Write a protein that binds this ligand. Structure first.
Ligand SMILES: CC(=O)N[C@@H]1[C@@H](O)[C@H](O[C@@H]2O[C@H](CO)[C@@H](O)[C@H](O[C@H]3O[C@H](CO)[C@@H](O)[C@H](O)[C@@H]3O)[C@@H]2O)[C@@H](CO)O[C@H]1O
Ligand SMILES: CC(=O)N[C@@H]1[C@@H](O)[C@H](O[C@@H]2O[C@H](CO)[C@@H](O)[C@H](O[C@H]3O[C@H](CO)[C@@H](O)[C@H](O)[C@@H]3O)[C@@H]2O)[C@@H](CO)O[C@H]1O
Ligand SMILES: [Ca+2]
Ligand SMILES: [Ca+2]
Ligand SMILES: [Mn+2]
Ligand SMILES: [Mn+2]
Lengths: 181, 51, 180, 46
């Protein structure tokens, strides 16, 4: 049996158990992925590799993650591009910026990607996003075109609490975002 | 309390390596916004297996 | 609040969350630090840095580790040198081998070492070990000469269960070895 | 059979704030195989 676990309730200035890529850094107890600045990417990884399944037995791990995040836009109308929790190869490095969220490079299935991500997408990119134009939560596997999406109303500047859970017995990945009022 | 939910069957062992790194990503393009995370908890549990 | 936890019940052939140094490697579900060969060093570290105290607040962590190990010697007389659980700087690398157990370099106190270690020492080194000559569990901070030791009888080839715990409220480090 | 050892060790004074933990084992003129069969660790910083 293998378990990996950690919790960070307030990030410190030198958070040595995280690997920072792009613009990610910690300021005033928060992990900052981007400032409200144009065309940037910020990524942050837990430093330990996690054993998520085994080729010998064919077993898959169960896991849960919860976090509180804040998106703070200049106003409720001009907001982009969003945010992602992802599971990638140990040597994952930033991919395309913009609507690709620093994690994919295409709209087409890319088997070399090997990453699955739950996106909180704030900008409607006409080429791949659900046509109704709403902001949404999406599950993405090897492509920026989510395999399933739910419309979400952004509350600018408010704390949102999310729980992501994977149940290995059913292969159900569940995502829950609550705004506390 | 207003909640949003999504569940999907995704057979992870068809997509990711056995060993992975997890993390967050956030981008801006022509439009922008600050993306911050205030706290983070994680726990994984693999029945039996390194092999 | 900062928390780090992990458990490895059986080590597989590719334990990517561990850093190996010297001859450390993993085989047949076990972490092998040393083979029964002379003059070797093996060490294995958990991959993540762990936050043990904080200068802003002055706070220090509570922690607990448990492991079961086996020492397998050619016979119960020709045994050396022992094994260590240690806490050291993030960039730590093997120090002197033999009686220095891969973590220290002198019997004199060295503030530069910044290493605390719990040792399971199977060889009597006259310049620093207990003069009774016995095999012993010892606590080391920045020196191979232990601050305190308990005589221990090795049981060749038997699994030993160890629990080491630190209580930040009293600053007491406890170690418990059991042959079940 | 059990062996127990206790000591006040004020960790802050000896160790950096951020550390790596692990195991070490050596041999010299004499030798033994040293193996670990399982490992559990947990820490909590307030
Ligand atoms: C119908 C209409 O006119 N809609 C406009 C959008 O055209 C406009 O969206 C931007 O359009 C630019 C050129 O048309 C693109 O370069 C922009 O893409 C970049 O920025 C977005 C958002 O950050 C990213 O997803 C992309 O990856 C690029 O980085 C963008 O599509 C917007 C405001 O810019 O107004 C609409 O009303
Ligand atoms: C009474 C008697 O002669 N007993 C011998 C010991 O003399 C001998 O110990 C070794 O002696 C060597 C010098 O004569 C040293 O080089 C050895 O040190 C190395 O090995 C030890 C044990 O592994 C380590 O602790 C040291 O760090 C060195 O690596 C050692 O002191 C032993 C070995 O044959 O047998 C006794 O019976
Ligand atoms: Ca988008
Ligand atoms: Ca010795
Ligand atoms: Mn989308
Ligand atoms: Mn000793």
């Amino acid at each position: 049996t293998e378990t990996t676990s950690f919790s960070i309730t307030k990030f410190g200035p030198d958070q040595q158990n995280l690997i920072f890529q792009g613009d990610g850094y910690t300021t005033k107890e928060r992990l900052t992925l981007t400032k409200a600045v144009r065309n940037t990417v910020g990524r942050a990884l837990y430093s330990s590799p996690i054993h998520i399944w085994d080729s010998k037995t064919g077993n898959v791990a169960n896991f849960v993650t919860s976090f509180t995040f804040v998106i703070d836009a200049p106003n409720s109308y001009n907001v982009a591009d969003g945010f992602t929790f992802f599971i990638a190869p140990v040597d994952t490095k930033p991919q395309t910026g913009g609507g690709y969220l620093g994690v994919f490079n295409s709209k087409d299935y890319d088997k070399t990607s090997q990453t699955v991500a739950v996106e909180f997408d704030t900008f409607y990119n006409t080429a791949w996003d659900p046509s109704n134009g709403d902001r949404h939560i999406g599950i993405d596997v090897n492509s920026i075109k989510s395999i399933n999406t739910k419309s979400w109303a952004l509350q600018n500047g408010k704390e949102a609490n999310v729980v992501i859970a994977f149940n290995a017995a059913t292969n159900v990945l569940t995502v829950s975002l609550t705004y506390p009022n | 309390e207003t909640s949003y939910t999504l569940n999907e069957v995704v057979p992870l062992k068809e997509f990711v390596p056995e060993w992975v790194r997890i993390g967050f990503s956030a981008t801006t393009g022509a439009e922008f916004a600050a993306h911050e995370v205030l706290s983070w908890y994680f726990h994984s549990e693999l029945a039996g297996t390194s092999s």
